[PDB]
Amino acid sequence: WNKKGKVNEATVQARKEKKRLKETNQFTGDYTGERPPHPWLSAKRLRSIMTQYQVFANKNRLNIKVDKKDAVEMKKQFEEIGAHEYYRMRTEQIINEKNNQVIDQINKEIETLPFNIYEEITKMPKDKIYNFNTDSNSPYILYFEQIARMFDEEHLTKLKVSQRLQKLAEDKLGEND
Amino acid sequence: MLNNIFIFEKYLKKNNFKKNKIILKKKFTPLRFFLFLLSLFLTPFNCMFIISFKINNKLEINFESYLI
């Protein structure tokens, strides 16, 4: 014996508030609780981004043509470069299989424990499982002086350095550097 | 070969999470959310074209392109 359920006013307002707010926006400014960014960023530096990203969105296949001679070489280059990588990539797929088997063996055995420690392992605090902090050991740090010299260009390194100042500006991990 | 290095750092967390697949799952405010995408146009390891909705999202990115 069960009857229909009536509506909550919460579902009502959300249906209506949107239509008030499709025209407006919630992202635009301190309407949202928003702190300013790292002051290394400036009004002019965003225009440096905008003025050139405005250029990238306006690109197409019709603003551009390419010579066939450049194209035919591009096959053998990126085909064989990829061929080395398919060999590399398909290994990880094979590797991760055997890695996951090892996890499956133990999870069968974790049941085969006493009462005390079996509580903790199942009921661990997520703070310990939630460690995504860096270390002195990170392959971007450990191999930095090597990798800085292995590339063909400084620009492709500048792809890394300018990338971090952004992410450092996001999590606010940069300060007065 | 860097791709072959992160297999370890990802492996150990499979035991910590008891999962076969791991993603870092950040969620950003608007300004932070755009700059993280500028990062991703300008990686040396990946050339990208980005697609999204008008609304920020819990992004699900691999550690490989992650860095600070």
């Binding site: 009004a43 | 300004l31 959310f33 755009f34 008008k54 920020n56």
Partner: peptide, 16 residues
């Protein structure tokens, strides 16, 4: 639409 619609909305406020 898409990513291009954050950017006329979010950025032009924080320029000032």
């Amino acid at each position: 639409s898409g990513l291009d619609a954050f950017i006329q909305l979010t950025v032009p406020y924080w320029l000032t």
